[PDB]
Design a protein around this ligand. Structure first.
Ligand SMILES: COc1cncc(-c2cc(F)cc(CNC(=O)c3cc(N4CC[C@@](C#N)(C5CC5)C4=O)cc(C)n3)c2)c1
Ligand SMILES: COc1cncc(-c2cc(F)cc(CNC(=O)c3cc(N4CC[C@@](C#N)(C5CC5)C4=O)cc(C)n3)c2)c1
Ligand code: PRO
Ligand code: PRO
Ligand SMILES: [Ca+2]
Ligand SMILES: [Ca+2]
Ligand SMILES: [Ca+2]
Ligand SMILES: [Ca+2]
Ligand SMILES: [Ca+2]
Ligand SMILES: [Ca+2]
Ligand SMILES: [Cl-]
Ligand SMILES: [Cl-]
Ligand SMILES: [Cl-]
Ligand SMILES: [Cl-]
Ligand SMILES: [Zn+2]
Ligand SMILES: [Zn+2]
Lengths: 488, 486
């Protein structure tokens, strides 16, 4: 690793994600290879989220990757938003197809004709379905690995309810699960909010979101999203059922959709990584502990070296007995300093050093990757202390990022205050009228050199909006404190 | 209740059963089908078994892009020539024509191997063992059939690269018996391990191994899983080369395998075990292993009954038996019987008021319909017993069929007779592509011709020395399994 994270964030990021062997570049731009080191993180997130939504009654399934032209168009706001980046398959071989078919940018228009077929009565609701699949949004803007890509992996959940209340309840349950993914799995603090009218999902009624802050770049990013679509899709696809209390009254299903993508890993990189490379939260780390033999003096007896390799394997089995994911790196090819650096780059939480003296002093050394602190631990305590230390790394990482967010998110009540705070690389909760025209005016007059976008309306703002407060536009009364910033 | 009869109209029976069991929904684009939860759970059961197994072998999961460049797509010529007609091309985003068309993967050799070339520099960088669960597209214009032959399907594809040929060779057989376990221990389907002929092998591979299942209802056989030794065919083309100090200055080409298994599995399960009442789920893969159904339906009597049902539910979740209590009051018991029979749940546990008061219940096996009265005591015992017995039963009934329908013939006269019987045939075979073409042509001439299925590792007989191929002109190389196929 050669570029410094605070000097050039993009070069740093690219260096870190490739040299940790998370990402390989592919010869089609905006498409990247998820190598096992990153895919294992996606799999940990999947293990957690899948079990949680199972408890909520959601079931997994798989819908086709192709959308017909007429299905894609039924909900005009939604297709108006997505149409410019829909990839169209037009031949197979040199044989033109009968009709162009589109690759799913999002599966509402794939799934909801099916929903309409399956909802025949109030007993068929609710329908709670989820799929883990890939989608394509073929924008021409510059792509960025993990954060903004042309193909990405994700989950998308789609549910249909008889009543608005059960649907509004699910929206928030899911959004809290996303917050749990970011905060408990990835040790990333997030702000829960609602999108403004301009930023909400096209076709939906309201969008709830979690926002993360990346202090290196001073910019925020959406980490997850949970929409209430209301009846805007069920009216276009005729997902209908007869009202049970009133005969012949056809009702339209109330719908939500919600998605979470591999953006998660990029945020985890941008937030925790440092100038030695990746830093993996223990809860998602592929390897949690790497055992590395040191000493190896060359005047060591064959008896001594064989006994040290033995002791390393004793540690390995020890840690496996208590469910710690542990790799012993007993390769004679590379030097110990080499391996130290190699596993630091990948961000293994703990490096476990065993050397001939500590080996017979009944102890070993643990090195935390987050703080760099070396600890000497007696053999006896290993699995206990190591687990206590993995816990402490998780906490420590979360805490640091929280201190970042608390320091870098502040209130401002006028446009001048706002502009200067924003220009110090912070995000700002300002009083806002909610109007698209004023949001555009903000983005215009506030131009790391782009105008601020609205990021969300927090469920729990920093200040209480005082009666009669006017927006930053000055022309209209303010409706809510809203988090604004520069954005990925 | 099911309408069509398997032995009368197999295609209609199949469509009826896959839709009414709520496995498949149709899509407005022909050739693509919706896997609903009931089918997807079977896929996920296969997924869990196979994932654990290949992990013990040192394969890791990953995810490669869906799109291939023209340059990459053509670098190995035999492979590209075989797949090009069925490759779907993206040509525009929105109303914007792309400068270069790009292709959707029909298989991911040409996505993955340019990366393999960058990762390999020394023998220490080997082996590379990567697997991906993903979707592929093969846009063929023949008529699709759900699960069996679709234009989009889910699969796993494993790709391995090794410094030496012996390691590669070992892995091909390891993966192939994993596939055989998936079929024989999970879906209760017997299969034939063998080698593809030169006409049927993976284009640009060295050799292809395969497992074939037999579908007695149609009389046809189907490939179920595939494991290819690619040799150095692709690494020479994508320059996956390494230096090893044992052989100074020689750039050495990696030895490579690829291996794949698809949702076709589920369809073969359906074709093999389904009956005229609908799907029949093997206990090992069944989403729901036992469905508890309250029968009958005062109130203290009603409430007591939903409660004893929930009692059985908690007791069965205790012992990791996958169980549903269908306590919906908006559907009658008969409706529920029919519904879960259509979905093939292995065991129906009926609780009526009389037997609730008599500390007993009734278990009904889906595969034989046989009803058994059971004490409340043995619910965790006898049920676990019965499920196990159902699994073996499905397997043994399947095997009988295979062993009755797979026979030897050593002359074309016999071969044709037995083939028209609805059976599959092992014949002495020269191995040549022309002979195989001719077997197909004349077996249709004298409603489709027979194709080579595999060359069995363990044939039914051994070839007499000096014996001739069933064509007469060339010495037979091996016994080869022929038959009509999907
Ligand atoms: C908006 O101006 C841009 C600026 N700079 C670059 C681009 C751009 C460039 C490209 F080459 C390709 C693309 C297309 N991909 C994406 O837009 C995208 C969106 C998301 N999203 C959107 C919000 C969400 C959350 N939570 C949704 C739940 C899903 C989530 O994860 C995730 C990923 C990996 N990719 C965009 C666009
Ligand atoms: C043979 O002439 C035909 C006759 N009648 C119809 C078609 C046809 C019609 C379509 F509309 C679409 C297609 C394309 N899909 C497939 O070719 C295909 C192959 C496999 N395969 C191939 C062997 C394999 C195994 N084991 C390999 C591991 C992969 C395995 O599962 C599985 C599935 C679900 N689909 C074919 C073709
Ligand atoms: O694209 C989105 O944001 C929604 C959430 C998952 C499905 N579509
Ligand atoms: O397409 C096939 O059949 C082989 C096996 C999976 C990858 N390629
Ligand atoms: Ca630069
Ligand atoms: Ca758009
Ligand atoms: Ca000591
Ligand atoms: Ca072909
Ligand atoms: Ca050869
Ligand atoms: Ca040379
Ligand atoms: Cl077409
Ligand atoms: Cl909140
Ligand atoms: Cl058929
Ligand atoms: Cl129920
Ligand atoms: Zn305003
Ligand atoms: Zn011959």
């Amino acid at each position: 690793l050669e570029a410094k994270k605070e000097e050039n964030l993009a070069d740093w990021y690219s260096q870190v994600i490739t040299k940790s062997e998370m990402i390989e570049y592919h010869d089609i731009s905006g498409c990247y290879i998820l190598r096992p080191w990153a895919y294992a993180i996606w799999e940990a997130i999947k293990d957690f989220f899948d079990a949680e939504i199972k408890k909520l009654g959601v079931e997994n399934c798989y819908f086709p990757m192709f959308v017909s032209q007429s299905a894609l168009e039924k909900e005009k706001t939604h297709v108006a938003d997505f149409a410019p980046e829909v990839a169209w398959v037009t031949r197979s071989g040199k044989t033109e197809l009968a009709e162009p078919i589109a690759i799913r940018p999002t599966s509402e228009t794939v799934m909801y004709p099916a929903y309409a077929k399956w909802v025949q009565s109030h007993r068929d609701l609710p329908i709670k379905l989820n799929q883990w699949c890939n989608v394509v949004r073929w924008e021409f803007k510059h792509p960025q690995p993990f954060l903004r890509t042309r193909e990405f992996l994700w989950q998308e959940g789609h549910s249909a309810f008889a009543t608005m209340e059960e649907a509004a309840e699910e929206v928030l349950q899911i959004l809290d699960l996303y917050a749990q993914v970011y905060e408990e799995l990835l040790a990333i603090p997030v702000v829960k909010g609602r999108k403004t009218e301009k930023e909400k999902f096209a076709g939906g009624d309201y969008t709830t979101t979690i926002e993360a802050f990346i202090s290196a770049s001073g910019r925020a990013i959406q980490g997850g999203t949970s929409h209430h679509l209301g009846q805007n899709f069920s009216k276009m696809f005729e997902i209908v059922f007869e009202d049970p209390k009133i005969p012949g009254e056809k009702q339209f299903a109330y719908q939500n959709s919600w998605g979470l993508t591999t953006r998660t890993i990029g945020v985890m990189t941008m937030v925790h990584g440092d100038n030695m490379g990746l830093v993996l939260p223990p809860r998602v780390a592929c390897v949690q502990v790497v055992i590395i033999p040191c000493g190896i003096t060359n005047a060591l007896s064959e008896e001594d070296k064989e006994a040290l390799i033995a002791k390393c394997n004793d540690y390995r089995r020890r840690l496996l007995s208590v469910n710690i994911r542990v790799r012993a790196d007993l390769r004679d090819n590379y030097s110990p300093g080499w391996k130290f650096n190699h596993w630091e780059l990948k961000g293994v939480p703990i490096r476990l050093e065993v050397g001939p003296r500590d080996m017979k002093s009944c102890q070993f050394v643990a090195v935390r990757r987050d703080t760099g602190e070396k600890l000497t631990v007696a053999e006896n305590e290993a699995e206990t202390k190591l687990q206590a230390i993995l816990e402490d790394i998780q906490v420590t990482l979360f805490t640091r990022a929280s201190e970042d967010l608390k320091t870098h998110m502040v209130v401002a009540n006028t446009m001048e205050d706002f502009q200067k705070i924003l220009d110090s690389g912070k995000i700002v909760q300002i009083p806002f009228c909610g109007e698209i025209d004023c949001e555009d005016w903000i983005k215009k007059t506030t131009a790391p050199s782009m105008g601020a976008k609205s990021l969300c309306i927090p469920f729990k703002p920093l200040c209480e909006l005082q009666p009669g407060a006017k927006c930053v536009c000055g022309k209209n009364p303010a409706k809510y404190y809203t988090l604004f910033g520069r954005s990925y």
